Symmetry: C5
Subunit: 219 residues, 5 copies
């Protein structure tokens, strides 16, 4: 069936896009909260799939699978807050940001089944674009290829309550692309990725698209 | 879309309107209960938004997010009682008020998902009014601008059971305005608020509506 | 709206009609069960409301709010049995009565949300009557005004299991009157109540229906 | 209403038909399982009701109310297996019988609300019969009145898991007769029952159907 | 009724197809995960039933009944991942395989009721075949009768979380055949099975299809 090769089926399925960890005390948790900016170019697997196209438009479904680091669940009340683009992100475990009515928040117990929410098409432009041959502001670093109109928002996680939580939390964020539309197909990345924000490739070790053989007649 | 600028969308979304805390023993809890009169002029954020209009009419949806102070949940049975206007409020952890059939009460376990209830348009007048240029009873303090026809009711929280609860409770009250209607738009508050019940402003430090610059030509 | 003054709205709302307590061991609990005969003339508040009419007919909805005496809930299996009129009531924590198919019983865990059940119009007569100027069998005590055709049934509560429960239980019984019909309105009780089963009033201290004043002209 | 005297209403309502107890260790539980053959002639109350008719046909609804002996519930996974007639019953806590696809089994946690299942009309004959004036194979004991075509099946209870359960279990089995049909009404048992499988009565102490009085004129 | 002898009814009902055990530490669990390739020829009971036909086509419903080895349940988050045919299976408790979007995974708590999922008809051929009189690649062992087009997939179980789970898990996998279709009926296996992948039988001890008797006239 040709349905299997349709843009939609190719970009369906919820995949893991991030793994936030909030230990009781260690390196980055005397805070008590986390700010994860929604990022797709996170996993090279999904990134390569997207960079097959120049422009894309879609909705995103997020599912929040949390539990303690060993898999155990406890009666802990959590809060996930979506900070749209152009909005101020929490800077402390108790910033005013957490009370701002305009930053939709979802409250759920770690015992309750995973929370699920859908985020629309945020760009101010007609489509997200993985490639911008210009500057949003010149030969050159910093400020090139960067298109801020792809900014999808930020998710701020934290345990509820005035005192810090006794439990460490390991949260897995899954995302599913709904209603996909793609434009202008381009060559498939054949060089290892070096950065999230640009096509730079290792220029000394340029790998060949295909494996080799001895003679052009041996097969 | 113009829908985004519609009165309804502007006043939608559930925001935090109050944070009640009932510790086992400290300052105000050898009682075991709390009486929160429904108050909107609580958070200056929402208050400024309302004082953009003279009269407003609407329904209110209340959601009760509770848990212990650190975010943990325990099998504690709670009772939230709505004491309408003109009704007697509980004066002790065990007043008759808690048994009065006419004071609707909702019983829920701290484990159960947040309780949610809708309160109608209580005023005896056609609309709530954030400004009353008269007296409900004269140059002058006390008894001015005060309109008792805006009184929306009181919520009385307490743990159920004859003995006091072993757990401390931190309850967050969220409110959402439904079916909003507004009349007679007025200037937007440009001076810091000094009191909940009146427009008094600091008259020595009168802030300018806009920032300044050197010359009227430098830009 | 006149709807607010309608017999139905006047007698709606679930009110507390009884508070049964079953401690592990104290005065009346080496038993392990309780027999509460359904009684409305329990709370003078609701009683006065009913004695505004001579005859009344209605269905009753019962809700069972239970928890330990301090409000905590535990995984305890309880059984509530309705013993109709003319049926034999349990006389021990393990009478045959608890197994009698004809005594409908509802089993629920103290963790599960409150059990709710509806009891119909039990009287063998066309309506319940709060006043019977005769004898069911003469100037006179005992056997007067007593109409057994108002007998609505009994509720027998107990913890399930062959051994006694480790936990103390405090159960609140709420009742709501559905489909109300009233006949022959009568004067409103103006003297304090002395007994559940009769209009006897303190005859030495007869209180006046209204407060007093000095002169009939001072106001 | 005549509806109350209808065969259906007379045989409705779920009654207790059995009480299985599986202690950790005592007399009959170093096993870890129980085999209860579905038996109606268990409780003389229901038995007398059935023997008012010669033939009966009906479906049966079974509800499984379990908990520890004191009424407490714990996170124990149980398995109830229905072994139809002509099928092999488990002979050990781990017989192959428990894995046989054809023996429908229902898995439920003691925390989950009571399991409920419906068993159809199993007899190979058109109706169950409480009386068979013949032999299924002669004056005489053993092998008389016994009709094996009334065999409804067996229920095998056990805790899941390879190791024995730490908890003792007391399970109450309730049964409700659905879609009842009865034929050929007969005299009502007036002598105490002596056995489950036959009408034998104590012949020395033959009780009179009615109480006595002195003279045939005194009343 | 002939419905009882229909291919569908004959192959219905969920039966146990596998019992995976993941102890904290013992022989095969310092790993923390398990890879069970979906196998029907597991239980000789069901296998014999299938080998009554040459070709079969059907969907499969899998139910995952898990709990600790003694039947107790704990708040443990588990993950069941379906690795289709031609896909790479996890090789460690934390392989990339567990993050691969294309390997559908279902997350469920051991407290939640058993997870249930349906797997379609995976073969690249029109039907699964329990007999292939050829080679997929000759008199002869290894590489005969083996048809890889019957490969249905693999299920990879594991506890979620970065650290190993404190609890041992015993998981029972039930399978139900939906929408069955069978072709070309063949003789029923009358010799004990020796291997999962071939009809080899013990040739010294060849058992007779029927029991014996003395004379051909004694009955």
């Amino acid at each position: 069936s040709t349905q299997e090769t349709a843009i939609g089926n190719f970009f369906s399925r919820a995949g893991l896009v991030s793994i936030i960890t909030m230990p009781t005390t260690g390196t980055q948790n005397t805070d008590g909260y986390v700010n994860w900016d929604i990022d797709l170019m996170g996993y090279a697997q999904l990134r390569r799939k997207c960079e097959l196209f120049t422009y894309m438009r879609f909705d995103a479904e997020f599912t929040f699978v949390v539990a303690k680091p060993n898999g155990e669940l406890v009666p802990q009340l959590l809060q996930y807050m979506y900070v749209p683009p152009g909005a101020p992100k929490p800077t402390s475990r108790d910033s005013f940001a957490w009370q701002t009515a305009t930053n939709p928040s979802v409250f759920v117990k770690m015992t309750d089944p995973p929370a699920q929410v859908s985020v629309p098409f945020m760009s101010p432009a007609s489509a997200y674009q993985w490639f911008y041959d210009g500057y949003p502001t010149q030969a050159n670093d910093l400020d090139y290829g960067q298109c801020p109109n792809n900014m999808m928002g930020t998710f701020s996680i934290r345990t509820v309550g005035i005192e810090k939580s006794p439990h460490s939390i390991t949260l897995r964020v899954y995302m599913r692309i709904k209603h996909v539309r793609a434009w202008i197909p381009r060559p498939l990345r054949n060089q290892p990725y070096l950065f999230k924000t640009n096509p730079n490739y290792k220029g000394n070790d340029i790998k060949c698209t295909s494996t080799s053989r001895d003679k052009i007649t041996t097969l």
